[PDB]
Design an enzyme around this catalytic site. Structure first.
Site, PDB file in Angstrom:
ATOM      1  CD  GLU A 161      18.485  -9.389 -20.832  1.00 50.24           C
ATOM      2  OE1 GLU A 161      19.447  -9.249 -21.450  1.00 50.24           O
ATOM      3  OE2 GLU A 161      17.452  -9.289 -21.379  1.00 50.24           O
TER       4      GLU A 161
ATOM      5  CG  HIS B 110      21.933 -13.894 -28.705  1.00 52.54           C
ATOM      6  ND1 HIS B 110      20.720 -13.905 -28.742  1.00 52.54           N
ATOM      7  CD2 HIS B 110      22.446 -12.541 -28.841  1.00 52.54           C
ATOM      8  CE1 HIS B 110      20.146 -12.725 -28.861  1.00 52.54           C
ATOM      9  NE2 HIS B 110      21.248 -12.077 -28.940  1.00 52.54           N
TER      10      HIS B 110
END
Length: 107
Positions: A70, A99
Site C-alpha cells: 500500500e 480507510h
C-alpha cells in the site's frame, strides 16, 4: 507524485513507488510519530508508502505467491488521510478512499 493516476502509472512504468515515498519504519527512523500527526514536520514532501498490506478480509483478488503493498495518496500534511493505492507483486492496482473499507480496480 501523490495522485491515484500519477502513482498508478509510475508503478506501471517503474515497478516501484516514486521517490517521495518512505515505509513506516523509515519515517519512524526520521522522527515520524503517528500520535503527533508530524510527518510533514520531520520529512517534508514525503508520504507513507511500500509496506505489505494483509488482505485478511479477502477484499482484494488473492493468489499464491501474490503479495499486496500500500501507499498513501493525496497526503500533504497533518495526520494520515483515508486514500490508499494497493499494488500487487504482479501489478494489479486498486484504490480505496475509505480507510480500506472498499476497493476499486484502477490497473
Amino acid at each position: 507524485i501523490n495522485t491515484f493516476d500519477g502513482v498508478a502509472d509510475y508503478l506501471q512504468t517503474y515497478h516501484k513507488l516514486p521517490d517521495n515515498y518512505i515505509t513506516k519504519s523509515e519515517a519512524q527512523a526520521l522522527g515520524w510519530v503517528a500520535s503527533k500527526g508530524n510527518l510533514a514536520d520531520v520529512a517534508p514532501g514525503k508520504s507513507i508508502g511500500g509496506d505489505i498490506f494483509s488482505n485478511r478480509e479477502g477484499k482484494l483478488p488473492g493468489k499464491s505467491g501474490r503479495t499486496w503493498r500500500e501507499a498513501d495518496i493525496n497526503y500533504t500534511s497533518g495526520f494520515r488521510n483515508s486514500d490508499r493505492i494497493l499494488y500487487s507483486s504482479d501489478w494489479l492496482v486498486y484504490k480505496t478512499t475509505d480507510h480500506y473499507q472498499t476497493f476499486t480496480k484502477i490497473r
